[PDB]
Amino acid sequence: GLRQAERNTEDGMSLIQTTEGFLQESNDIIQRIRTLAIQSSNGIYTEEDRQMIQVEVSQLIDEVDRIASQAEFNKMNLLQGDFARGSRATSMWFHIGPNMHQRERVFIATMT
Amino acid sequence: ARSLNLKGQSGELLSLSTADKSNDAIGTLDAALTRISKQRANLGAYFNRLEHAAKG
């Protein structure tokens, strides 16, 4: 049981590594838009340049929306928040101990 | 060019033999430049999306 247990633990840690890897690029996908919005504060800009910035931001947000819709690990979606604090669909359990009742939960909110 | 209305729908070439033609033709080229800039922004979003997807 313990031998299966550390295998389960390392698989779960790999899953968490997948989550964080899904997170760093999203941090970038927020920050570059933050920079663009800060740049937009300049009054020297026209209105057509603002429209082009909005057009850019359209696809830019489409990127993170597509990632959230398709962020998956072992035929299971992650960023949809099906497992949030107020989970609506189901839960995951990590059987880290040999006993049947030694299972633990992790909570991730909706990232859409 | 026809889509950018630089030439007529039948293929007529935008002439500048008249002084007033040059003044009115200015707005045409400004609109063409604006559309080119919009397409440039579109391609910018395109490659930004491509590189984000690649790293992910």
From TrEMBL, chain B:
It comes from the Bacteria. It is found in: Periplasmic flagellum; Periplasm. Component of the core of the flagella. Belongs to the bacterial flagellin family. This is Flagellin. It comes from Leptospira biflexa serovar Patoc (strain Patoc 1 / ATCC 23582 / Paris). The gene is flaB2. The chain holds residues 170 to 225 of 281 of the full protein.
